[PDB]
Amino acid sequence: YPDKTIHQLFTEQVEKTPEHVAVVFEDEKVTYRELHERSNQLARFLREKGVKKESIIGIMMERSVEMIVGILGILKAGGAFVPIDPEYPKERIGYMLDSVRLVLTQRHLKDKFAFTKETIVIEDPSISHELTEEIDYINESEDLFYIIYTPKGVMLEHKNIVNLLHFTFEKTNINFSDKVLQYTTCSFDVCYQEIFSTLLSGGQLYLIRKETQRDVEQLFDLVKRENIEVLSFPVAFLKFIFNEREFINRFPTCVKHIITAGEQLVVNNEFKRYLHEHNVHLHNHYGPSETHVVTTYTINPEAEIPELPPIGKPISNTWIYILDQEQQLQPQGIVGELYISGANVGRGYLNNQELTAEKFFADPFRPNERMYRTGDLARWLPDGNIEFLG
Secondary structure (H helix, E strand, C coil): CCCCCHHHHHHHHHHHCCCCEEEEECCEEEEHHHHHHHHHHHHHHHHHCCCCCCCEEEEECCCCHHHHHHHHHHHHHCCEEEECCCCCCHHHHHHHCCCCCEEEECHHHHHHHCCCCCEEECCCCCHHHCCCCCCCCCCCCCCEEEEEECCCEEEEEHHHHHHHHHHHHHHCCCCCCCEEECCCCCCCCHHHHHHHHHHCCCCEEECCCHHHHCCHHHHHHHHHHHCCCEEEEEHHHHHHHCCCHHHHHHCCCCCCEEEEECCCCCCCHHHHHHHHHHCCEEEEEECCCCCCCCEEEEECCCCCCCCCCCCEEECCCEEEEEECCCCCECCCCCCEEEEEEECCCCCEECCCHHHHHHHEEECCCCCCCEEEEEEEEEEECCCCCEEECC
16 A cells, blocks of 8 residues: 555645546535645645644534645645534533644634634635645655544544555445545544545545435435435444335435445345345445444345345455454454454544553554454454454
């Protein structure tokens, strides 16, 4: 996998497809050059305001093209971002401003919260006066990418997310270069899997308003008009869809790939019928915020479809151990605790490494590697797939 940062790889994609549409938001359609230049201006502004290597920058925006520019600008300037839901209670916000240099937000959210930290608005007209030319990137692969809160601030490096994305490009044929729906809320780690696997493969990232994301009828229809062929929904969403006859009827049928994560996936007969009927590839993904997605399982729609599909096998440069309470390996079929090692393992919990010492270990079998203890229970299947239980 490339020893590159997310913004470095994004820049190389702008070189390949500068005039291709990168982001679609209702009326607004933004090209890769537009997205690159606008985030370049913000990155210059952010560095002018003190953003340096590995600076922790809070970002709180609604679903918008401005959010995409903000994330890219924060990474280009050299820092890591902390996603904050604008719908969260303003005491819950204060938790996330822990050790944050400044807050990048929008006009109305600068009003709503009156932060206890330095605040930059994306609509600031000073930003648009900065140079749209490229900049010198200052980050290495192991630099922090974001800090996501679950409340503990989970730290993930550029290396971890790049490895998952590189496996997605090299070892799967999900057409991320086509139109992809950005469904997941910005406070979840899957949201950035949707955003950057599309942006780093030349595809069209389709953003939606908060109300469209909550309107199932409006959502399925937008996929139909725009022919969005890659969909990403939580497991609970798919269970909700295929328990209602009304929604099964309206579910888009010419989608090429559906990616899902969350609790154990349950595929009832109508869901099984849907996948077989329309040749839709359902991908089961697993991973905690500390390591992101590390195992995948793609349901073959032409074979028999398991009603409880496994979470699959480790992605490249990732090793999975099912250990006992003494961290000894369990034989196939014996329930144990999931441990994750390899390139995806993050840096730990922000400003709390007593908890990090409890959850992050050295790999006893691969001494160079970092190991993370998930607390989830699983079984090795005889075919090498992992059965996720809890």
